[PDB]
Model the fold of this input.
Amino acid sequence: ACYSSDCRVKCVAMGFSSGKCINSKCKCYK
Ligand SMILES: [Cl-]
Done:
């Protein structure tokens, strides 16, 4: 599943701004 905290942290680790869980997907904000 997608979990909010982990998704945000994954996204930031890759150089994105943040991210959110949408429909089971961790979608990063650029
Ligand atoms: Cl979700």
